[PDB]
């Protein structure tokens, strides 16, 4: 019971660091999406006129419309990498690792985390954008010219299945830590200390899901099985990006993403 | 007394759990064995034989020495922030403060604590590095090319003054809590509970210094006066960073390494 006690202290610390690191939580996203009075309605982009109306109404942090939208999603990923790096530093043992292994774990982990957390902002019909101020429809994203028309479809397909697990922010905080502390990332110098941390995080996630979802049979196993889909999302994203880069020689990538993508293939 | 003696013991126990290299362990290492870095030749031997924590992994980013020692120290500060952050959550009332205020208190607190605890690792002749495995001489640090040659000198000048107070870990544990619970940090939302907790910590520190150092006249006042010096060190360190970011180096930190370093200040 003292062993399980330490796992609860870890869960609490991770949930705390997650709230401090990520300004748009699943709790806030669901409040925006479902019309709760705690939060404000998003402007909906579903076509070219609504996009233009949106460009004026929303002041986006992040050229032909399909290229601008894709680049907008990539610049948001740059921001997500910054937030995920701040979160990773909070995971006990992470900053104690060899600096080069910290880089390797972030390199191979950040997109898996990005698309995990993106599901929090999605329903079957679209995705929250611009810190939840906007909502871009799935059908509008599907309507973009080749090779941009399908770029978000694998993320939506994953999200609909992932969201069926009904995880909250406290569950996701531990799950994203598990994804980062993967001892099987290519070119790790010291695997053992990473595996030891992941063992502790897996114990913490199992206990969290048992306490938080006591009527959800094998929720832990079903969540771990979702890491299969996550890997395929990232592989397919990197492959599509290789095509986009070559068809659109005028489209720039941030060096942070370029350096990550370079080794992903 | 009961509340104040419980607070003193609780903070001591938490400090021992949070900080691997205590003043007791550091003074034991310093008074009798670490590898001594007194020049370029000894540094090169040490890196080859022991692979120093932050400095040696940075060989992948630079062929220069001074920038790797300085940036190595910066990455030790990144790691100290997480030890201090884990410690802060054990201070009674801290985790019940507004989450934004917790972030604000650590943002302005961590650097004063880093230089407080660095004194524990210092004598007038040098500093323990790499988890106590190395001792880098004050004269070697002074020999580094401008503007790196001066970066530790203000920390040494403070450490010699601070170390003359002859505080131990049980005293330091309460003092670092006092630093964190400062109601005068900019942008705090709810100052009342911060000042309420600091009042209790100040009472606990005053009693701890009276019981632990009964013959040390006005030790409490003289320790609180050192907070002036800590603020000055942090200010001078940020000033030096601005000079360093106009200095030519071969160091091009991996973008993910730059991300890990970002948000230290």
From Swiss-Prot, chain A:
PDPK1 activates its transcriptional activity independently of its kinase activity. There is a cross-link at residue 20 (Glycyl lysine isopeptide (Lys-Gly) (interchain with G-Cter in ubiquitin)). Disulfide bonds: none annotated. Nuclear receptor that binds peroxisome proliferators such as hypolipidemic drugs and fatty acids. Once activated by a ligand, the nuclear receptor binds to DNA specific PPAR response elements (PPRE) and modulates the transcription of its target genes, such as acyl-CoA oxidase. It therefore controls the peroxisomal beta-oxidation pathway of fatty acids. Key regulator of adipocyte differentiation and glucose homeostasis. ARF6 acts as a key regulator of the tissue-specific adipocyte P2 (aP2) enhancer. (Microbial infection) Upon treatment with M.tuberculosis or its lipoprotein LpqH, phosphorylation of MAPK p38 and IL-6 production are modulated, probably via this protein. It is linked to Defects in PPARG can lead to type 2 insulin-resistant diabetes and hyptertension. PPARG mutations may be associated with colon cancer. Obesity: A condition characterized by an increase of body weight beyond the limitation of skeletal and physical requirements, as the result of excessive accumulation of body fat. Residues 1-48 are annotated as: Interaction with FAM120B. This is Peroxisome proliferator-activated receptor gamma. Its main location: nucleus. The keyword Phosphoprotein applies. It comes from Homo sapiens (Human). Highest expression in adipose tissue. Lower in skeletal muscle, spleen, heart and liver. Also detectable in placenta, lung and ovary. Residues 6-263 form the NR LBD domain. Induction: (Microbial infection) Expression increases when incubated with M.tuberculosis or its lipoprotein LpqH; induction is TLR2-dependent (at protein level). Rosiglitazone binds at residues 74-77, 111, 237, 261. A motif (9aaTAD) lies at residues 255-263. Phosphorylated in basal conditions and dephosphorylated when treated with the ligand. May be dephosphorylated by PPP5C. The 9aaTAD motif is a transactivation domain present in a large number of yeast and animal transcription factors.
């Amino acid at each position: 019971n003292p062993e399980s006690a330490d796992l609860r202290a870890l869960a609490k610390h991770l949930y705390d660091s997650y709230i401090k690191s990520f300004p748009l939580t699943k709790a806030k996203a669901r409040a925006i999406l479902t019309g709760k009075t705690t939060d404000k309605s998003p402007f909906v982009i579903y076509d070219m006129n609504s996009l233009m109306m949106g460009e004026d109404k929303i002041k986006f942090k992040h050229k032909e419309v399909a290229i601008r939208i894709f680049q907008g999603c990539e610049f948001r990923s740059v921001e997500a990498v910054q937030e995920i790096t701040e979160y990773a530093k909070s995971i006990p043992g992470f900053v104690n690792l060899d600096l080069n292994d910290q880089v390797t774990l972030l390199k191979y982990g950040v997109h898996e985390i990005i698309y995990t957390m993106l599901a929090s902002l999605m329903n079957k019909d679209g995705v929250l954008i611009s810190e939840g101020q906007g909502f871009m429809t799935r059908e509008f994203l599907k309507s973009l010219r080749k090779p941009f028309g399908d770029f978000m479809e694998p993320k939506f397909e994953f999200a609909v299945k992932f969201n069926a697990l009904e995880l909250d922010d406290s569950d996701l905080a531990i799950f994203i830590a598990v994804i980062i502390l993967s001892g099987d990332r290519p070119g790790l110098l010291n695997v053992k200390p990473i595996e030891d941390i992941q063992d502790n995080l897996l114990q913490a996630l199992e206990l969290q899901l048992k306490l938080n979802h006591p009527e959800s049979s094998q929720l832990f196993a079903k969540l771990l099985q979702k890491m299969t889909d996550l890997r395929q999302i990232v592989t397919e994203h990197v492959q599509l990006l290789q095509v986009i880069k070559k068809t659109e020689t005028d489209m720039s990538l941030h060096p942070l993403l370029q350096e990550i993508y370079k080794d992903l293939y």
